[PDB]
């Protein structure tokens, strides 16, 4: 709809009377003026808003009776206007003509015809008038006509350039919001409820990701409400303009003042939340009201004395100091307060606190007679131009100070006062102490710097000056010793065959430095020096192992010598050699990139460009201290948020990009990268966020943990995405590396036993129902079936393998005592062996050993079990009706548990010893010692776990003695009723790793050679049921951990058997790099 509102800006210097002018025509006095409704903002006072947060007409007003001096005073205003809205209309009105002779009128008339109306650099003043007085005038009648017609003309001009007129149509929903924001009654008008207000007005502009940002954008430009977009009080805090302006302006007037006393007053004036108060102070900085000095003080630039304090400097002879001048036509408004804010952090030691003094127009730092610094404004007669003077003592520390000062000045101007980049830079020098200084432009000194000569007096050769004394910042004399270029080491040709690449900065060549391969950036005639120094500022102070460091810089040919990667870009590797890209290598690359991001984010630097092209590899050797680095720190791969082209980049944009990198690493084919070849789908795909399952879609081997990390990372909402610090913490995990698969079982399925086929599937029992039900899991497809095969509940399964006969059978022992034997090659071949006198408690198998609940052990001949109703070879009575057999272990002598005794068998099945273990109660606790044995692990000692024990007993089988106890509670006691500490199962690996499962979702990794805790693996599931060691169909060894996850959920987790080693190796890797980070940062 045809929006008919436009802002009116009234500006001028203090004393003009322009407020009354407005009243006759009809911080800041804001009010509507229906004529066309103008939103009039009367900047009667010094409301920095015109620079601190800069469809409007600029009415400039000045007092004619003051004259031409005032006209010149308006140049900074005109500059600022052009600098933010060069296309905007400007009407210049002089006033108080009734007390100003026409001499002044025509003097000022000629003044503006000579210096403003036809002068570039000013925003082409559209018209002008002279007014007798604010009482009314024919001139004002004409002015009213001028303003109306010209504002119409302006919008016509916008249509010619922008494409919008004074009835330009804007989405009506935005118009509605304006009205909704108008209707707001809040005591402390800081708004967050806006989300609700959207919901109050039905739900308009529902594209929160696009329309909402546009509405907000409009609302600031239209002068309705204020976002403050890195402040905390920014996005969710829309504040009424009247309060922003009023309160901050008043507090200024309510010069060093302690923060706390300001807080005291403020708390009485307006009871802001202390959180808001911290932001309040940050806003005072942002809006140039007050600058932070120490953490307890504010400078308050405005109102500082403007009578440069008497300063006596040490050093007097010309050669003792260095002087630099900046010639300007006028200082921009706010130039000084911004400059001061930057200069306050200067320090010659950053590679005692200084006696600081403030002039408003200058800063004096003292430090020491050895090194001090004075920056301030000075003006000479017959030279209308104003200008800066910088003075430092001529020595290395003085140089360092100078470098920091001029870098801040140039950066200030590039960001805030472009257009000037005027700024005639002069250096002062003399050929003899006691004489006057001579001026020279730095450009000419640069011409001489290229020669490398001494400055020579053209009339007298005897008089020369080393350039460094005049301009030690043209020659890079302020570099750290560590990066000064040694010209006897650097070896390069600048020949075509060494060209590695180029850019707007010049070119890059391959070279040698101190015997190493390096890259040399050359600033080959591209506004050099300034670009060079900008790069030097960024490169220094960033010293992380994952970044490309600077290996010395040198002004003689203007070079940056940097580390050259030996294996090249990740991109190439992804499309060059998947064999190098092992699972181990991939993980390490992810860590190194994550560190770089964490570091740069803590350094307040947004990378904005992660991709395989920017990742460099320095060795493909998986176990190296440093493998990947991020290039050039300081396309179709964009976050969907920033892809809109209407928001601001931040760490969350980088995180999103990182997630995509990880996705690209996961699928080593670079399949989404291949998608780039069809960019119309590729860029949109990323925008949609609808990425395909990396496993299913590309045929990529499963990698859980990472898979969910990517999903967690790539969220639509920036506020829901993980921080880069968190991303790293997640990547920092042995579990991440070694977890390979996780299969959930169907809801309410309880498996009490497992048999993996050593040849890729698992036979599962089922204790959920009370019926003999046998299930089956296909690891190749995660397929699952199940059928009832017996009456009573299946207790134990065993695999009979007869490779000689080319067949195999599953033996199912159950509660009834029967043995159901089923051919694995033929489901129809089912038969039952001689029924046992009691239930089957365990199976082992060659002989099929059947341990029953009455302590009886049946031994069946290897092949005999094929026949239905077959009897065992022999039967032993080991225990009794109350002492069931529960474990037959063997690692050709058998060992096992019967009640509280440990038995052992010969190859003739004879008892070789009955070890009563109950006697261990002299140690530990009798209710733990006196309990049925659950499992026996046979190594160089026996490891016994008993039912409901928290302690594992270690026995010396050679002497039958207790040799130690393992307290599981203790280990988890160190870890900060899920902590039952009950031992569930024991598994043993011959590399000394001992795997102990427990009641809660924890797995302890112990070191058999020292009996020490390697690591606690936890938050696995609700409870661990069984653990198996099994070789997969790809010959990999893994742990099969079956657990409960009560909603009776249960699941199978597959771990890479080398977990114990990965835990230790990863830890080492990280610590080494941690030390290197400190090494680098400390050198500086």
């Amino acid at each position: 709809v045809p929006y008919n509102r436009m802002k009116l800006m009234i500006v001028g210097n203090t004393g003009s009377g322009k407020t009354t002018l407005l009243q006759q025509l009809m911080g800041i006095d804001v009010k509507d003026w229906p004529i066309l409704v103008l939103n009039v903002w009367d900047f009667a006072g010094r409301e920095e808003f015109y620079s601190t947060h800069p469809r409007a007409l600029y009415l400039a007003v000045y007092d004619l009776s003051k004259g031409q001096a005032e006209v010149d005073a308006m140049k900074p205003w005109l500059f600022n206007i052009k600098a933010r809205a060069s296309s905007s209309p400007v009407i210049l009105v002089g006033t108080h003509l009734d007390v100003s002779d026409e001499k002044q009128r025509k003097a000022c008339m000629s003044k503006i015809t000579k210096e403003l109306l036809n002068k570039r650099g000013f925003p082409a003043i559209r018209d002008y008038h002279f007014v007798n007085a604010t009482e009314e005038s024919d001139a004002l009648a004409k002015l009213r006509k001028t303003i109306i017609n010209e504002s119409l003309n302006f919008k016509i001009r916008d249509q010619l350039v922008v494409g919008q007129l004074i009835p330009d149509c804007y989405v009506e929903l935005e118009k509605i919001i304006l009205s909704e924001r108008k209707n707001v009654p809040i005591e402390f008008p800081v708004i967050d409820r806006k989300r609700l207000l959207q919901l109050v007005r039905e739900n308009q502009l529902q594209l929160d990701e696009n329309e909402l940002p546009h509405a907000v954008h409009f609302l600031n430009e239209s002068g309705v409400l204020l976002h403050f977009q890195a402040l905390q009080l920014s996005d969710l805090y829309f504040v009424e303009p009247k309060w922003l302006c009023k309160i901050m302006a008043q507090i200024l007037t309510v010069g060093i003042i302690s923060r706390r006393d300001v807080e005291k007053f403020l708390s009485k004036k307006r009871k802001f939340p202390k959180n808001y108060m911290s932001q309040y102070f940050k806003l005072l900085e942002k809006f140039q009201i007050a600058l932070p000095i120490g953490e307890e003080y504010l400078l308050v630039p405005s109102s500082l004395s403007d009578h440069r304090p008497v300063i006596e400097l040490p050093h007097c002879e010309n050669s003792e100091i260095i002087i630099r001048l900046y010639e300007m036509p006028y200082f921009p408004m706010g130039f000084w307060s911004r400059l001061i804010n930057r200069l306050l952090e200067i320090s010659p030691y950053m590679l005692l606190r200084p006696n600081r003094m403030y002039w408003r127009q200058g800063i004096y730092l003292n430090w020491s007679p050895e090194a001090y610094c004075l920056v301030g404004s000075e003006v000479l007669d017959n030279h209308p131009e104003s200008f800066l003077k910088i003075t430092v003592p001529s020595c290395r520390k003085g140089c360092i100070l100078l470098g920091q000062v001029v870098d801040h000045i140039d950066s200030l101007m590039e960001e805030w006062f472009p257009g000037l980049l005027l700024l005639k830079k002069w250096a002062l020098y003399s050929f003899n102490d006691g004489e006057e200084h001579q001026k020279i432009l730095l450009d000419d000194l640069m011409k001489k710097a290229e020669e490398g000569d001494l400055l020579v007096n053209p009339d007298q050769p005897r008089l020369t000056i080393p350039i460094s004394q005049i301009a030690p910042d043209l020659i890079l004399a302020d570099l750290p010793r560590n990066i000064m270029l040694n010209n006897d080491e650097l070896e390069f040709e600048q020949a075509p065959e060494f060209l590695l690449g180029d850019g707007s900065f010049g070119s890059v060549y391959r070279a040698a430095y101190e015997g190493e391969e390096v890259a040399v950036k050359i600033f080959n005639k591209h506004t050099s020096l300034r670009l060079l120094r900008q790069e030097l500022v960024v490169l220094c102070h960033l010293h992380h192992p994952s970044l490309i460091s600077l290996l010395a810089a040198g002004i003689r040919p203007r070079m940056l010598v940097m580390e050259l990667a030996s294996k090249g870009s990740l991109d190439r590797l992804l499309q060059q050699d998947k064999a190098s890209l092992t699972r181990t290598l991939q993980h390490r690359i992810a860590l190194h990139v994550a560190d770089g991001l964490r570091y740069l984010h803590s350094a307040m630097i947004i990378y904005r460009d992660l991709k395989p092209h920017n990742v460099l590899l320095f060795t493909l050797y998986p176990n190296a201290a440093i493998i990947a680095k991020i290039a050039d720190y300081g396309p179709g791969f964009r976050a969907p948020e920033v892809a809109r082209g209407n928001v601001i980049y931040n760490q969350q944009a980088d995180v999103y990009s990182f997630g995509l990198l990880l996705y690209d690493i996961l699928t080593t084919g670079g399949r989404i990268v291949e998608g780039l070849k069809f960019p119309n789908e590729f860029d949109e795909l990323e925008i949609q966020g609808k990425l395909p399952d990396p496993v299913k879609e590309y045929g990529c081997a499963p990698w859980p943990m990472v898979e969910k990390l990517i999903k967690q990372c790539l969220k639509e909402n920036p506020q829901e995405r993980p921080t880069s610090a968190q991303v790293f913490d997640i990547l920092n995990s042995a579990e991440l590396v070694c977890l390979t698969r996780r299969i959930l079982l169907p809801k309410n399925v309880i498996v009490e036993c497992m048999v993996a086929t050593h040849h890729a599937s698992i036979w599962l029992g089922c204790g959920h129902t009370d019926r003999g039900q046998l299930s089956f899991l296909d690891l190749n497809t995660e397929g699952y079936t199940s059928e009832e095969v017996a009456d009573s509940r299946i207790l134990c399964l065993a695999l009979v393998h007869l490779p000689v006969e080319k067949e195999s059978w599953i033996v199912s022992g159950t509660q009834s005592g029967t043995l159901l034997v089923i051919n694995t090659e033929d489901g129809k071949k089912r038969h039952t062996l001689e029924k046992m006198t009691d239930s089957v408690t365990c199976l082992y198998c060659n002989f099929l050993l059947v341990g029953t609940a009455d302590g009886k052990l049946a031994i069946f001949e290897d092949k005999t079990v094929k026949l239905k109703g077959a009897a065992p070879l022999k039967i032993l009575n080991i225990g009794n009706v109350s002492t069931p057999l529960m474990c037959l272990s063997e690692s050709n002598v058998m060992w096992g548990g019967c009640g509280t005794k440990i038995f052992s068998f010969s190859n003739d099945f004879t008892i070789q010893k009955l070890i009563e273990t109950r006697t261990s109660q002299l140690f530990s606790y009798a209710a733990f010692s006196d309990s049925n044995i659950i499992t026996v692990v046979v190594d160089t000692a026996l490891y016994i776990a008993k039912q409901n024990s928290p302690v594992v007993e270690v026995w010396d089988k050679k002497t039958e003695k207790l040799c130690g106890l393992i307290d599981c509670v203790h280990f988890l006691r160190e870890v900060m009723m899920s902590y039952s500490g009950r031992v569930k199962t024991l598994c043993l690996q011959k590399n000394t790793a001992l795997w102990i499962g427990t009641g809660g979702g924890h797995i302890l990794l112990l070191d058999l050679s020292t009996r020490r805790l390697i690591r606690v693996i936890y938050n696995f599931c609700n409870s661990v049921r069984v653990m198996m060691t099994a070789q997969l169909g790809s010959l990999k060894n893994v742990m099969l951990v079956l657990g409960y996850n009560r909603e009776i959920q249960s699941c199978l987790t597959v771990w890479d058997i080398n977990l114990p080693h990965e835990v230790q190796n990863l830890e080492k890797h990280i610590e080494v790099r941690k030390e290197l980070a400190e090494k680098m940062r400390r050198t500086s």
Side-chain angles (χ1 to χ4, degrees), residues 1-152 163 167-182 185 189 211-1084:
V1 296
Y3 181 73
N4 291 284
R5 175 182 286 268
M6 176 176 171
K7 298 187 300 292
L8 177 64
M9 298 293 150
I10 300 171
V11 299
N13 289 313
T14 302
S16 68
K18 64 189 178 297
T19 297
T20 301
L21 176 62
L22 176 61
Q23 290 288 314
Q24 189 61 37
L25 290 172
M26 293 178 70
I28 302 170
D29 182 346
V30 179
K31 185 173 182 177
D32 285 349
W33 183 13
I35 301 172
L36 177 63
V37 179
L38 299 178
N39 186 346
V40 181
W41 295 68
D42 180 353
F43 288 73
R46 180 60 55 186
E47 174 58 70
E48 298 85 5
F49 185 59
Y50 60 71
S51 63
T52 59
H53 185 75
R55 301 187 186 90
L57 182 148
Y58 292 82
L59 179 63
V61 179
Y62 71 95
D63 183 337
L64 184 61
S65 70
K66 182 172 176 184
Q68 291 176 330
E70 183 59 22
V71 172
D72 286 341
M74 292 302 293
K75 288 178 180 176
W77 284 99
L78 291 173
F79 174 78
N80 187 61
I81 292 167
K82 183 178 187 298
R84 296 293 180 270
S86 67
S87 68
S88 67
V90 178
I91 300 172
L92 178 64
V93 178
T95 191
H96 297 172
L97 179 58
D98 64 355
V99 294
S100 177
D101 191 275
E102 70 176 341
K103 179 180 177 181
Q104 290 180 312
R105 180 185 59 78
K106 70 182 182 180
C108 290
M109 179 187 69
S110 69
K111 182 70 170 178
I112 66 172
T113 59
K114 290 180 180 180
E115 298 182 30
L116 295 176
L117 293 176
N118 63 358
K119 180 68 176 180
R120 68 178 182 174
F122 299 110
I125 298 170
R126 291 293 78 205
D127 207 339
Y128 64 92
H129 293 279
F130 297 95
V131 178
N132 286 339
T134 60
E135 68 184 356
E136 181 60 57
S137 178
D138 290 346
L140 292 176
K142 290 178 181 179
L143 177 59
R144 290 182 185 96
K145 290 178 181 179
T146 297
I147 292 168
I148 292 168
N149 288 339
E150 189 59 15
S151 68
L152 293 171
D168 185 74
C169 296
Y170 295 84
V171 174
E172 68 185 344
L173 300 179
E174 292 174 338
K175 181 179 178 181
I176 291 168
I177 291 169
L178 186 157
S179 294
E180 293 300 329
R181 176 60 179 77
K182 181 178 178 181
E211 289 175 323
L212 174 61
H214 287 170
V216 171
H217 181 75
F218 178 80
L219 291 170
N220 279 51
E221 289 185 351
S222 63
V224 177
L225 56 68
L226 302 172
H227 72 66
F228 300 99
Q229 296 178 320
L231 303 176
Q232 298 300 307
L233 192 159
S234 62
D235 291 341
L236 299 177
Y237 304 89
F238 297 100
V239 179
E240 181 69 36
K242 290 179 180 179
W243 272 38
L244 179 66
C245 292
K246 180 178 179 179
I247 292 169
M248 292 176 74
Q250 289 178 334
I251 293 299
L252 177 62
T253 65
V254 173
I256 298 170
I257 300 171
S258 175
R259 183 191 299 275
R260 301 302 179 183
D261 288 342
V262 172
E263 289 175 341
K264 289 174 187 171
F265 179 83
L266 180 61
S267 72
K268 293 180 180 179
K269 183 67 174 179
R270 290 291 183 273
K271 283 71 173 183
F272 288 106
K274 289 181 179 179
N275 289 340
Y276 292 11
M277 291 176 73
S278 70
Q279 296 301 289
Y280 179 80
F281 285 110
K282 187 64 178 178
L283 291 172
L284 292 173
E285 181 184 3
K286 197 269 188 181
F287 287 90
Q288 302 294 289
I289 302 302
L291 304 177
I293 294 170
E295 67 278 23
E296 298 296 316
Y297 297 93
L298 299 174
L299 182 59
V300 195
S302 176
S303 86
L304 294 176
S305 172
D306 61 354
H307 300 287
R308 65 182 291 174
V310 176
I311 299 170
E312 183 66 15
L313 300 178
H315 299 281
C316 297
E317 293 180 43
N318 292 351
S319 69
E320 294 182 87
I321 61 172
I322 300 170
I323 301 170
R324 187 67 55 81
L325 300 175
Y326 288 76
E327 183 179 354
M328 300 179 71
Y330 53 80
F331 291 107
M333 294 181 290
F335 177 87
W336 281 103
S337 68
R338 289 182 182 279
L339 179 60
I340 291 168
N341 190 28
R342 289 182 181 278
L343 295 178
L344 290 173
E345 297 300 317
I346 292 171
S347 175
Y349 294 105
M350 72 179 289
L351 292 176
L352 299 176
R353 297 294 191 270
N355 187 20
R356 298 193 294 272
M357 299 179 69
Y358 310 97
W359 311 4
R360 185 179 179 186
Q361 299 293 301
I363 299 172
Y364 176 70
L365 305 179
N366 189 75
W367 294 101
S368 173
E370 181 175 332
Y372 64 92
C373 181
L374 177 64
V375 179
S377 174
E378 292 187 342
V379 178
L380 300 176
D381 288 347
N382 302 323
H383 298 288
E385 295 85 344
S386 67
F387 43 86
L388 301 177
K389 180 182 281 177
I390 302 168
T391 300
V392 298
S394 178
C395 69
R396 179 176 173 82
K397 289 177 181 170
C399 182
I400 292 168
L401 291 171
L402 179 60
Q404 290 178 29
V405 172
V406 301
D407 289 339
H408 283 299
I409 292 169
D410 287 354
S411 294
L412 176 63
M413 291 188 293
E414 290 177 34
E415 290 182 343
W416 295 100
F417 306 108
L420 293 173
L421 295 171
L422 299 177
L423 302 177
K424 194 177 296 182
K425 294 181 178 179
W426 297 98
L428 299 181
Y429 68 88
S430 68
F431 291 102
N432 185 35
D433 286 345
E435 298 185 10
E436 297 293 332
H437 290 288
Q438 296 182 5
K439 295 180 180 177
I440 186 166
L441 294 176
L442 290 178
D443 288 347
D444 289 342
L445 288 175
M446 290 177 70
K447 291 174 185 170
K448 297 298 182 183
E450 290 296 322
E451 296 298 313
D453 295 346
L454 302 176
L455 184 65
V456 179
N457 182 316
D459 297 314
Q460 176 56 263
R462 292 176 186 170
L463 301 177
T464 65
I465 301 169
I467 291 170
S468 294
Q469 290 181 14
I470 296 170
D473 58 332
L474 294 178
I475 303 302
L476 299 175
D478 61 340
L479 299 178
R481 298 289 180 191
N482 288 331
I483 60 170
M484 293 183 184
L485 181 65
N486 184 336
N487 286 329
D488 293 330
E489 295 297 333
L490 185 65
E491 182 178 2
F492 67 98
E493 300 293 327
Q494 300 187 66
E497 65 275 22
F498 300 111
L499 183 66
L500 298 177
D502 62 18
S504 68
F505 65 90
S507 67
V508 179
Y509 294 90
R510 185 170 65 86
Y513 186 77
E514 298 183 350
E516 298 182 358
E517 293 288 321
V518 300
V520 179
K521 293 184 179 182
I522 300 173
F523 292 80
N524 188 9
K525 300 183 181 179
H526 300 289
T527 309
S528 70
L529 182 63
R530 177 58 179 159
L531 291 177
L532 178 60
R533 289 187 64 83
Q534 288 178 327
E535 293 299 315
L536 289 171
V537 171
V538 172
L539 291 172
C540 295
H541 313 159
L542 299 176
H543 303 286
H544 192 279
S546 66
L547 301 177
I548 305 300
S549 69
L550 178 65
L551 301 177
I555 197 65
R556 178 71 281 161
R558 300 178 186 276
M559 294 175 171
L560 300 175
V561 178
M562 300 183 78
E563 296 180 56
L564 178 65
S566 65
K567 300 299 183 183
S569 173
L570 178 61
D571 183 67
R572 181 175 66 187
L573 180 59
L574 290 171
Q575 295 177 317
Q576 184 65 50
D577 185 7
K578 291 178 181 177
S580 292
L581 297 173
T582 66
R583 179 61 66 85
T584 298
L585 181 61
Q586 290 172 37
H587 178 259
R588 296 298 188 265
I589 292 168
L591 288 173
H592 293 184
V593 172
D595 281 337
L597 292 172
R598 186 179 69 256
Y599 183 79
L600 292 174
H601 289 169
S602 71
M604 300 299 289
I605 299 170
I606 306 302
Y607 188 69
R608 301 187 294 159
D609 192 26
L610 294 172
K611 60 185 177 183
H613 302 81
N614 291 334
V615 178
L616 301 178
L617 302 175
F618 288 76
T619 184
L620 298 177
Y621 179 57
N623 191 27
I626 300 173
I627 297 171
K629 297 190 182 189
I630 298 172
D632 292 321
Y633 55 90
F637 283 134
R638 290 170 294 174
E641 185 68 20
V642 301
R644 296 294 177 186
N646 61 10
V647 299
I648 299 169
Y649 284 89
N650 59 63
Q651 293 85 336
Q652 301 302 94
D654 284 345
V655 170
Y656 185 94
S657 181
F658 177 82
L660 291 174
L661 177 61
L662 182 59
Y663 185 88
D664 292 353
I665 293 168
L666 177 61
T667 300
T668 60
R671 292 290 298 276
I672 202 170
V673 173
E674 291 299 311
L676 177 60
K677 291 175 178 174
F678 306 97
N680 287 337
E681 295 179 356
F682 177 73
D683 186 65
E684 183 63 22
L685 176 61
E686 293 185 29
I687 292 168
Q688 290 291 315
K690 296 176 181 177
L691 298 178
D693 181 317
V695 173
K696 182 177 179 179
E697 183 64 23
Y698 307 124
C700 180
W703 194 359
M705 294 291 289
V706 170
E707 290 174 30
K708 70 179 181 180
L709 176 58
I710 292 168
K711 290 179 180 178
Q712 290 174 351
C713 182
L714 301 178
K715 294 181 180 181
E716 183 63 15
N717 184 353
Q719 299 301 309
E720 296 177 26
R721 293 195 290 270
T723 62
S724 63
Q726 289 171 301
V727 170
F728 176 73
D729 288 346
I730 293 168
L731 291 174
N732 185 354
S733 170
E735 298 81 351
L736 178 64
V737 174
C738 296
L739 178 62
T740 63
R741 300 184 66 184
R742 181 178 179 173
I743 300 172
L744 299 178
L745 299 176
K747 186 174 185 175
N748 295 325
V749 177
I750 300 173
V751 177
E752 296 296 320
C753 60
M754 296 177 66
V755 178
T757 299
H758 189 198
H759 201 275
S761 66
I762 301 171
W763 288 99
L764 303 174
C766 183
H768 182 74
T769 70
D770 61 351
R771 300 291 297 170
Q773 182 174 349
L774 178 65
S775 295
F776 182 67
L777 176 66
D778 180 12
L779 296 175
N780 287 331
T781 62
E782 300 183 355
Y784 179 85
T785 190
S786 184
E787 66 179 15
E788 184 176 353
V789 298
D791 287 336
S792 67
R793 180 179 292 157
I794 296 171
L795 299 177
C796 299
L797 298 174
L799 175 64
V800 177
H801 183 203
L802 298 171
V804 173
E805 299 298 332
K806 306 296 180 185
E807 63 184 78
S808 60
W809 302 78
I810 302 301
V811 179
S812 176
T814 189
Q815 289 179 323
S816 70
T818 60
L819 299 173
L820 178 63
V821 181
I822 302 174
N823 194 315
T824 60
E825 300 296 322
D826 184 355
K828 292 179 180 178
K829 293 183 176 75
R830 301 186 175 89
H831 67 271
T832 301
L833 300 178
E834 182 180 2
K835 184 176 181 182
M836 298 293 102
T837 59
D838 207 330
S839 67
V840 178
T841 59
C842 63
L843 298 172
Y844 180 84
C845 186
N846 297 284
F847 298 90
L848 176 63
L849 304 181
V850 180
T852 60
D854 63 358
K856 185 181 291 179
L857 177 62
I859 300 94
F860 291 78
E861 189 275 320
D862 196 345
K863 292 182 184 181
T864 295
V865 299
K866 183 172 179 175
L867 301 177
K868 184 176 180 181
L873 176 62
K874 65 191 289 182
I875 298 173
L876 303 176
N877 294 316
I878 304 301
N880 63 61
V881 70
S882 66
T883 57
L885 298 177
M886 295 182 69
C887 182
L888 299 173
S889 295
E890 186 182 20
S891 178
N892 66 1
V893 176
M894 298 299 294
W895 295 88
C898 179
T900 60
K901 296 179 182 177
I902 299 171
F903 55 81
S904 180
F905 299 114
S906 73
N907 64 327
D908 295 331
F909 306 104
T910 63
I911 297 171
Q912 297 298 304
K913 59 186 68 180
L914 300 175
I915 300 170
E916 177 64 67
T917 66
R918 189 179 305 106
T919 63
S920 69
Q921 70 179 315
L922 292 174
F923 302 86
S924 189
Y925 178 54
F928 294 158
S929 290
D930 186 351
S931 179
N932 291 341
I933 296 170
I934 300 301
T935 185
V936 179
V937 179
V938 180
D939 190 73
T940 55
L942 302 177
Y943 297 85
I944 306 299
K946 292 175 173 174
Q947 187 174 346
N948 298 327
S949 177
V951 177
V952 177
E953 296 181 354
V954 180
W955 289 80
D956 179 8
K957 66 184 180 181
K958 292 180 181 179
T959 61
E960 302 180 353
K961 302 293 181 184
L962 182 65
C963 296
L965 300 172
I966 301 171
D967 182 341
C968 291
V969 171
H970 176 72
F971 292 136
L972 296 177
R973 181 167 60 195
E974 292 297 321
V975 175
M976 181 65 72
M977 62 82 69
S978 68
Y979 287 87
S980 68
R982 299 288 181 84
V983 176
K984 291 294 184 181
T985 63
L986 303 176
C987 295
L988 181 148
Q989 187 178 352
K990 295 292 179 177
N991 69 342
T992 78
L994 180 66
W995 295 71
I996 301 175
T998 190
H1002 300 74
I1003 300 172
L1004 304 178
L1005 299 177
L1006 302 180
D1007 179 359
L1008 289 172
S1009 69
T1010 62
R1011 298 182 181 174
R1012 295 290 183 271
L1013 181 63
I1014 294 168
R1015 182 168 176 85
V1016 179
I1017 306 301
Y1018 71 100
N1019 203 25
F1020 175 76
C1021 68
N1022 189 321
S1023 181
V1024 177
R1025 179 62 181 88
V1026 297
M1027 298 179 72
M1028 298 181 70
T1029 299
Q1031 184 174 40
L1032 298 177
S1034 61
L1035 305 180
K1036 296 179 182 179
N1037 294 324
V1038 299
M1039 296 297 293
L1040 304 176
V1041 180
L1042 175 67
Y1044 296 99
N1045 192 30
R1046 183 175 59 250
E1047 298 291 313
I1048 298 300
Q1049 178 65 49
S1050 65
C1051 62
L1052 175 65
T1053 301
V1054 180
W1055 295 92
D1056 184 309
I1057 195 65
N1058 292 283
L1059 174 61
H1061 292 296
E1062 184 62 17
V1063 170
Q1064 291 179 317
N1065 286 341
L1066 179 61
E1067 180 64 19
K1068 180 178 177 180
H1069 177 78
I1070 292 168
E1071 182 61 14
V1072 170
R1073 293 178 68 254
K1074 182 177 180 180
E1075 291 180 358
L1076 291 175
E1078 291 301 331
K1079 180 180 177 180
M1080 291 174 70
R1081 200 197 42 81
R1082 175 213 56 67
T1083 285
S1084 308

